[PDB]
Design an enzyme around this catalytic site. Structure first.
Site, PDB file in Angstrom:
ATOM      1  CG  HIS A  62      -1.917  -1.271   1.284  1.00 47.24           C
ATOM      2  ND1 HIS A  62      -1.316  -2.172   2.340  1.00 47.24           N
ATOM      3  CD2 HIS A  62      -2.586  -1.771   0.611  1.00 47.24           C
ATOM      4  CE1 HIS A  62      -2.331  -3.175   2.174  1.00 47.24           C
ATOM      5  NE2 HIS A  62      -3.125  -3.025   1.098  1.00 47.24           N
ATOM      6  CG  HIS A  94      -0.745   8.547   1.818  1.00 51.00           C
ATOM      7  ND1 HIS A  94      -1.590   7.255   1.567  1.00 51.00           N
ATOM      8  CD2 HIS A  94      -0.601   8.764   3.041  1.00 51.00           C
ATOM      9  CE1 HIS A  94      -1.727   6.884   2.875  1.00 51.00           C
ATOM     10  NE2 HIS A  94      -1.010   7.786   3.772  1.00 51.00           N
ATOM     11  CD  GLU A 104      -4.342   9.558   2.561  1.00 48.68           C
ATOM     12  OE1 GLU A 104      -3.925   9.655   3.705  1.00 48.68           O
ATOM     13  OE2 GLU A 104      -4.643   8.556   1.628  1.00 48.68           O
ATOM     14  CB  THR A 196      -6.211   8.149   5.246  1.00 50.02           C
ATOM     15  OG1 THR A 196      -5.021   7.560   5.049  1.00 50.02           O
ATOM     16  CG2 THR A 196      -6.234   9.245   6.347  1.00 50.02           C
TER      17      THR A 196
HETATM   18 ZN   LIG Z   1      -0.759   7.923   5.723  1.00 48.21          ZN
END
Ligand SMILES: [Zn+2]
Length: 258
Positions: A62, A94, A104, A196
């Site tokens: 991820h 991210h 995000e 998240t």
């Molecule tokens: Zn994160």
């Protein structure tokens, strides 16, 4: 569970296995700078990373986690909106497929190239697994990244990524100083929210720094060479591993600064 960020397993599907996806304090959110209210009751934020002990870097399919020894109060976050002591367990990022997306949180709907999350847990709950079950269990320090000049203190991270290309791979990652990823200012917004990613637990006090850090195009490019898949599977580039902004609902975002 087979959640990810594709067309078929992405954020819009997560709610089926993780119903709290549609709950009352989900992250990330859009930070309306004209609605967030300066809160003179916030104390100054205290980032104590002098004694931090990094151990390892992991591609979990991820993102990648730089992991820290959190068996003592070596690297901690206190102050600001926080009561007590939160211990640094890991950081990760991210990011996007292009420089105009990746973060995000957003600021007045603006998306940054990436976002850094330094993840801390409340010592009062004894361990991380216990802390994620508590509304004040975690404190995540969010830092936006923008493309411009290179960040020297990111380059060691950048350079180890060849060696953890695919899901499941890890590398030794000792003596990394996370202070090098901070911006100059600690001005912040704060609000109550969630993890998240799945399991999307509503256990986080979000502290999002106003001032982004700059990184180079070459640096961010090397994040995009990572893989979501494991070794010897078809290559899916690790890009756009970000959850879009979720409804604010019955929540206020408080600013540390006028
Ligand atoms: Zn994160």
């Amino acid at each position: 569970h087979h959640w990810g960020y594709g067309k078929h397993n992405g954020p819009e599907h997560w709610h089926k296995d993780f119903p709290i996806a549609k709950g009352e304090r989900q992250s990330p959110v859009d930070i309306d700078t004209h609605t967030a209210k300066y809160d003179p009751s916030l104390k100054p934020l205290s980032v104590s990373y002098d004694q931090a002990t990094s151990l390892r870097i992991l591609n979990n399919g991820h993102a990648f986690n730089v992991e820290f020894d959190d068996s003592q109060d070596k690297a901690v976050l206190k102050g600001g909106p926080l009561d007590g002591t939160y211990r640094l367990i890991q950081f990760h990022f991210h990011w996007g497929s292009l420089d105009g997306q990746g973060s995000e949180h957003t600021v007045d709907k603006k998306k940054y190239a990436a976002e850094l999350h330094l993840v801390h847990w409340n010592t009062k709950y004894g361990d991380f697994g216990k802390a994620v079950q508590q509304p004040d269990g975690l404190a995540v320090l969010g830092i936006f990244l923008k493309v411009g000049s290179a960040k020297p203190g990111l380059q060691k991270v950048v350079d180890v990524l060849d060696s953890i290309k695919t899901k499941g791979k890890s590398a030794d990652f000792t003596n990394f100083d996370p202070r090098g990823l901070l911006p100059e200012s600690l001005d912040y917004w704060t609000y109550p929210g969630s993890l998240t990613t799945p399991p999307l637990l509503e256990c986080v006090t979000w502290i999002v720094l106003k001032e982004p850090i700059s990184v180079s195009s070459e640096q961010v490019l090397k994040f995009r060479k990572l893989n979501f898949n494991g070794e010897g599977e078809p290559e899916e580039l690790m890009v756009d591993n970000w959850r879009p902004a979720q409804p604010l609902k019955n929540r206020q975002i408080k600013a540390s600064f006028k």
